[PDB]
Enzyme design. Sequence first.
Site, mmCIF file in Angstrom:
data_model
loop_
_atom_site.group_PDB
_atom_site.id
_atom_site.type_symbol
_atom_site.label_atom_id
_atom_site.label_comp_id
_atom_site.label_asym_id
_atom_site.label_seq_id
_atom_site.Cartn_x
_atom_site.Cartn_y
_atom_site.Cartn_z
ATOM 1 N N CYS B 108 61.779 74.724 58.403
ATOM 2 C CA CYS B 108 60.980 74.650 57.182
ATOM 3 C C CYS B 108 60.389 73.268 56.893
ATOM 4 O O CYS B 108 61.109 72.292 56.650
ATOM 5 C CB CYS B 108 61.787 75.147 55.954
ATOM 6 S SG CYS B 108 60.872 74.971 54.405
ATOM 7 N N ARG B 111 60.683 71.322 52.888
ATOM 8 C CA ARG B 111 62.003 71.012 52.332
ATOM 9 C C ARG B 111 62.068 69.832 51.361
ATOM 10 O O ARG B 111 63.096 69.618 50.735
ATOM 11 C CB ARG B 111 63.041 70.853 53.453
ATOM 12 C CG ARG B 111 63.460 72.175 54.082
ATOM 13 C CD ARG B 111 64.460 71.940 55.206
ATOM 14 N NE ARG B 111 63.816 71.483 56.443
ATOM 15 C CZ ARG B 111 64.466 70.903 57.442
ATOM 16 N NH1 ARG B 111 65.770 70.693 57.330
ATOM 17 N NH2 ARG B 111 63.816 70.527 58.544
ATOM 18 N N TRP B 280 55.429 78.465 48.051
ATOM 19 C CA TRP B 280 53.977 78.606 48.052
ATOM 20 C C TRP B 280 53.465 78.346 49.467
ATOM 21 O O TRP B 280 54.176 77.759 50.285
ATOM 22 C CB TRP B 280 53.318 77.652 47.067
ATOM 23 C CG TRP B 280 53.714 76.229 47.209
ATOM 24 C CD1 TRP B 280 53.226 75.322 48.125
ATOM 25 C CD2 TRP B 280 54.655 75.529 46.403
ATOM 26 N NE1 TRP B 280 53.824 74.097 47.928
ATOM 27 C CE2 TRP B 280 54.707 74.194 46.876
ATOM 28 C CE3 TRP B 280 55.475 75.886 45.320
ATOM 29 C CZ2 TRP B 280 55.541 73.229 46.304
ATOM 30 C CZ3 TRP B 280 56.299 74.935 44.757
ATOM 31 C CH2 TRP B 280 56.321 73.617 45.242
ATOM 32 N N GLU B 285 49.230 78.926 57.426
ATOM 33 C CA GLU B 285 49.981 80.170 57.522
ATOM 34 C C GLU B 285 49.047 81.366 57.405
ATOM 35 O O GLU B 285 49.155 82.325 58.167
ATOM 36 C CB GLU B 285 51.077 80.243 56.457
ATOM 37 C CG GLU B 285 52.141 79.159 56.594
ATOM 38 C CD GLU B 285 53.231 79.301 55.537
ATOM 39 O OE1 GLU B 285 54.069 80.201 55.714
ATOM 40 O OE2 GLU B 285 53.247 78.545 54.533
HETATM 41 C C1 HEM Z 1 57.875 75.514 48.428
HETATM 42 C C2 HEM Z 1 56.948 75.580 49.386
HETATM 43 C C3 HEM Z 1 57.304 75.963 50.843
HETATM 44 C C4 HEM Z 1 56.500 75.716 51.884
HETATM 45 C C5 HEM Z 1 55.129 75.001 51.824
HETATM 46 C C6 HEM Z 1 57.155 76.213 53.078
HETATM 47 C C7 HEM Z 1 56.643 76.155 54.344
HETATM 48 C C8 HEM Z 1 57.162 76.831 55.428
HETATM 49 C C9 HEM Z 1 56.454 77.140 56.650
HETATM 50 C C10 HEM Z 1 54.979 76.766 56.940
HETATM 51 C C11 HEM Z 1 57.306 77.778 57.464
HETATM 52 C C12 HEM Z 1 56.983 78.321 58.873
HETATM 53 C C13 HEM Z 1 56.907 79.838 58.689
HETATM 54 C C14 HEM Z 1 56.108 80.507 59.766
HETATM 55 O O1 HEM Z 1 55.330 79.804 60.467
HETATM 56 O O2 HEM Z 1 56.250 81.752 59.903
HETATM 57 C C15 HEM Z 1 58.588 77.917 56.774
HETATM 58 C C16 HEM Z 1 59.743 78.506 57.246
HETATM 59 C C17 HEM Z 1 60.920 78.691 56.549
HETATM 60 N N1 HEM Z 1 61.175 78.375 55.215
HETATM 61 FE FE1 HEM Z 1 59.880 77.250 54.048
HETATM 62 N N2 HEM Z 1 58.374 76.787 52.716
HETATM 63 C C18 HEM Z 1 58.498 76.655 51.338
HETATM 64 C C19 HEM Z 1 59.562 77.126 50.583
HETATM 65 C C20 HEM Z 1 60.754 77.632 51.053
HETATM 66 C C21 HEM Z 1 61.881 78.097 50.257
HETATM 67 C C22 HEM Z 1 61.920 78.122 48.703
HETATM 68 C C23 HEM Z 1 62.849 78.496 51.103
HETATM 69 C C24 HEM Z 1 64.268 79.053 50.798
HETATM 70 C C25 HEM Z 1 64.884 78.957 49.603
HETATM 71 C C26 HEM Z 1 62.356 78.300 52.460
HETATM 72 C C27 HEM Z 1 63.054 78.563 53.620
HETATM 73 C C28 HEM Z 1 62.486 78.707 54.866
HETATM 74 C C29 HEM Z 1 63.152 79.288 56.009
HETATM 75 C C30 HEM Z 1 64.603 79.825 56.119
HETATM 76 C C31 HEM Z 1 62.118 79.268 57.117
HETATM 77 C C32 HEM Z 1 62.330 79.776 58.559
HETATM 78 C C33 HEM Z 1 61.899 81.239 58.579
HETATM 79 C C34 HEM Z 1 61.963 81.768 59.986
HETATM 80 O O3 HEM Z 1 62.688 81.178 60.837
HETATM 81 O O4 HEM Z 1 61.296 82.800 60.256
HETATM 82 N N3 HEM Z 1 61.080 77.784 52.385
HETATM 83 N N4 HEM Z 1 58.454 77.325 55.539
HETATM 84 C C1 LIG Z 2 59.349 87.243 57.137
HETATM 85 O O1 LIG Z 2 60.505 86.911 57.909
HETATM 86 C C2 LIG Z 2 60.443 85.606 58.494
HETATM 87 C C3 LIG Z 2 59.770 85.697 59.861
HETATM 88 N N1 LIG Z 2 58.643 84.763 59.927
HETATM 89 C C4 LIG Z 2 58.523 83.856 61.058
HETATM 90 C C5 LIG Z 2 57.627 84.742 58.956
HETATM 91 C C6 LIG Z 2 56.557 85.618 59.131
HETATM 92 N N2 LIG Z 2 55.561 85.650 58.244
HETATM 93 C C7 LIG Z 2 55.568 84.835 57.179
HETATM 94 C C8 LIG Z 2 56.602 83.931 56.942
HETATM 95 C C9 LIG Z 2 56.520 83.051 55.703
HETATM 96 C C10 LIG Z 2 57.386 81.797 55.806
HETATM 97 C C11 LIG Z 2 57.313 81.059 54.482
HETATM 98 C C12 LIG Z 2 58.335 81.216 53.555
HETATM 99 C C13 LIG Z 2 58.280 80.569 52.326
HETATM 100 C C14 LIG Z 2 59.421 80.761 51.358
HETATM 101 C C15 LIG Z 2 57.186 79.752 52.029
HETATM 102 C C16 LIG Z 2 56.168 79.618 52.994
HETATM 103 N N3 LIG Z 2 55.077 78.836 52.761
HETATM 104 N N4 LIG Z 2 56.250 80.277 54.178
HETATM 105 C C17 LIG Z 2 57.656 83.875 57.855
#
Ligand code: HEM
Ligand SMILES: COCCN(C)c1cncc(CCc2cc(C)cc(N)n2)c1
Lengths: 407, 411
Positions: B108, B111, B280, B285
């Site tokens: 992520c 963070r 958000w 994405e």
């Molecule tokens: C607040 C703005 C946030 C932004 C801009 C953000 C951004 C991102 C992005 C760009 C990814 C890559 C996802 C992908 O390419 O499919 C990601 C993954 C992830 N985010 Fe964040 N995120 C945010 C909030 C959060 C929150 C609130 C949580 C949990 C409480 C979180 C937990 C995770 C986790 C666990 C992943 C890995 C998901 C996976 O392995 O498929 N994120 N995030």
């Molecule tokens: C949906 O299960 C997770 C699998 N993956 C890789 C996945 C597929 N499509 C969209 C997201 C969104 C990840 C994501 C999550 C949050 C909380 C914020 C943000 N900006 N982006 C994750």
Amino acid sequence: RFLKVKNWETDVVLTDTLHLKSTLETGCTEHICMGSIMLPTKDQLFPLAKEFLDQYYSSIKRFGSKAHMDRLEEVNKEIESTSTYQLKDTELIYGAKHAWRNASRCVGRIQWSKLQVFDARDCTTAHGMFNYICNHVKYATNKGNLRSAITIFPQRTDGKHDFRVWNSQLIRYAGYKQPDGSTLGDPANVQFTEICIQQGWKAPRGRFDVLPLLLQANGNDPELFQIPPELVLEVPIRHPKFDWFKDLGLKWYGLPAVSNMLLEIGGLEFSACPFSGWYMGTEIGVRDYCDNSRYNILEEVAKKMDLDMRKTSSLWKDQALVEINIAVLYSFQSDKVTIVDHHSATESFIKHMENEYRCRGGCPADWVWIVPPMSGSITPVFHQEMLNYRLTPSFEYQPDPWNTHVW
Amino acid sequence: RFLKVKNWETDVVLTDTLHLKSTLETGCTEHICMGSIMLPVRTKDQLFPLAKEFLDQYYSSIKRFGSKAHMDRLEEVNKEIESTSTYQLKDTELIYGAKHAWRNASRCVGRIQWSKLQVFDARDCTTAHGMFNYICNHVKYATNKGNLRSAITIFPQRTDGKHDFRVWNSQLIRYAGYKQPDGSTLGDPANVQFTEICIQQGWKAPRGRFDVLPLLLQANGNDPELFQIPPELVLEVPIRHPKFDWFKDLGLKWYGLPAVSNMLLEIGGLEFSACPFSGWYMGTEIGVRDYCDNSRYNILEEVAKKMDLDMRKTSSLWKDQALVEINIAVLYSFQSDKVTIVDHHSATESFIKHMENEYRCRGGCPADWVWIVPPMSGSITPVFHQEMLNYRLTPSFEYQPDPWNTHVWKG
Ligand code: HEM
Ligand SMILES: COCCN(C)c1cncc(CCc2cc(C)cc(N)n2)c1
Ligand code: HEM
Ligand SMILES: COCCN(C)c1cncc(CCc2cc(C)cc(N)n2)c1
Ligand SMILES: C[C@H](O)[C@H](O)[C@H]1CNc2nc(N)[nH]c(=O)c2N1
Ligand SMILES: C[C@H](O)[C@H](O)[C@H]1CNc2nc(N)[nH]c(=O)c2N1
Ligand SMILES: [Zn+2]
């Protein structure tokens, strides 16, 4: 123990068995992945020789043959007597091609079997090395129709008589720090340049000065030589739509030629082994031109395009980046110098990877290095799971010679 | 032991000690790196040490380590585990746990925001209808009329693995995908399988390009039930371009709220199998992956045509050129509509500052370079040049199998 890799765009799954023969170590452990870190005796020698001759003889459909046993015999004898051994020309050529085949960071490996190997093991002097390198440069360049080549200098003996090319690439531009505090030329080469000067190079303090060769033969003191300007093919960079781009005064050289790596074959170590192919466009336009610690020209280009550089969200950096990369490919193509775009190259690598899995049981690949530095996910390699592991023969990093050189 | 990471753009070197607290395994070995691999009912036996490790962390964080309150809580949990075979987290521990699972999420990039997370405790929920209500409230709170707020809603933890709470949707809000008899796809190709499940469960599909999927909600191990999120709670943004007026006629829009709903939250050995969380979007994405993946909406060609780029050879970089314009449009549209979004430059720059702060204050920041680097323009963002160390810390968010593959149907 048998590993699957998946392509997430095509669902195609390959099974890797080749990793089981890897012997060197990754830096990774069960508890930590270092996938993004850039740099993570007679008894020693014979299993290494054996491992190699076994794969060589397997490769020529002659495993478990008298000739195989005979060679293993002979090398064994020679190691006992001389503490080392000499590769047959056939083995040297095989080893070099396989070092490239095994280079997990190289996207251009579909070409691995088409490598011209120049045997320079008879070389004794830095003048001799200069001659061999000019010939390599002329051959590889081939008037813009580039051909992959490697030139191999004598192997390490006791580490006291090392052959080394001090330059990181055969052709690179000098860098100079100014009173102005700024940097003139290529910032990556400031320290090597000063070493040249300190050794007597007469710098023309320009922005694109082709560095001289600093050549070290037989563990002796390194000497300076200038590559004949007529052998260094360069390309003025223009844009097919922006007439002003030429005013930036940008140019680049046609021949990418790595000269600071170490070739290991059958336990033997070749510390001087310059090798060359042809460029993928992003190497020049994304990294060389737009890296903040390189020529770093994004701002100037953006200005000339009159983009709104107030907020990052206008993606003005991204827009300029694409154009700069358009100009590089356009300039090389126009002057008929071999170059490959990142789409073509990564597409080629996917097919290579499939061939390798199909005909070898796998293909070691470093995703961090294979995915291009722009437009990553619109290339097929982004979606391709890869397994990274070390096979031999191999190209290895080695310390810059100046930190190690007892003058 | 000490481990160094280097930034090759700045030569800034950081030293990691946090990796020593890593417990779970990576998939890598001394002989192979699996850094690019996407995916590489507990006994009381294993449960109390997990509880203890968690409670030691929690009490250290509040500067009460070794206190009577710390000691009493360990005792209380031990007894609850040995008599009931599990235990319940205090609200304080639950909130701490959920924030740290996000803080620990190595994939992520967002963070820097980890400490600002609204935690909704839904552990008193018993039915799918109750789950629907909780999720509606989460969506409304998180959306906040476009001023997005990060949130997570936590449903009851696993007990025997036969009574799991699950949200079957991969994200709370997503568009339907429909496979046509001619092999073409209408809508989002990513969601074809899930769409078919919804239809089989009785959903009446409108069959358009942007149909918001119904929620499929499973409470207490029972068969999942369908609910439609009220349309008024689903904020969407029509996509247009600031310079290109034809871009609107492409008919594109997207939803504002990214809300992952298929992951498992592990805290102190307890397993929360239904824990939807939302933040958000980062623009790429949507603009890179959602729109331009070949396996998704795949609009690069149509866009490139309308820009009249040379599409006869890849070397014209028409795909790269169209890709940038689409991403400009996404950012422009969200900003113009006052819906929270961050560009990949801001987000990666903020992440580097976050990472450096974490090294200094925490001894490390586990990070997955493969996922952190954005899917366009990689090396003109600072994360590309940053060495990273990937390792697993708990509390954590984990993948779990898709429920349709494991569910025992009641009928
Ligand atoms: C607040 C703005 C946030 C932004 C801009 C953000 C951004 C991102 C992005 C760009 C990814 C890559 C996802 C992908 O390419 O499919 C990601 C993954 C992830 N985010 Fe964040 N995120 C945010 C909030 C959060 C929150 C609130 C949580 C949990 C409480 C979180 C937990 C995770 C986790 C666990 C992943 C890995 C998901 C996976 O392995 O498929 N994120 N995030
Ligand atoms: C949906 O299960 C997770 C699998 N993956 C890789 C996945 C597929 N499509 C969209 C997201 C969104 C990840 C994501 C999550 C949050 C909380 C914020 C943000 N900006 N982006 C994750
Ligand atoms: C012929 C066309 C070739 C293409 C298009 C190509 C492409 C590339 C690219 C893009 C990289 C990444 C370099 C960087 O980002 O710094 C690379 C790395 C590498 N290439 Fe190739 N290459 C070619 C030929 C060769 C040949 C002929 C050899 C050896 C005989 C070779 C061996 C290597 C090695 C060892 C690396 C890794 C260097 C490192 O670790 O820093 N390549 N190649
Ligand atoms: C120079 O040796 C160290 C390797 N590194 C990091 C390095 C730094 N800059 C440029 C290159 C050139 C890589 C390269 C090599 C070859 C043979 C072909 C090609 N297209 N590209 C390599
Ligand atoms: C094979 C590879 O791991 C896979 O395509 C990954 C690469 N990096 C990624 N990075 C992000 N942020 N999201 C992704 O879905 C992926 N996919
Ligand atoms: C920190 C990171 O490992 C470093 O920036 C790497 C990333 N990927 C790369 N990929 C290529 N092809 N060349 C490089 O120099 C790098 N640099
Ligand atoms: Zn690894």
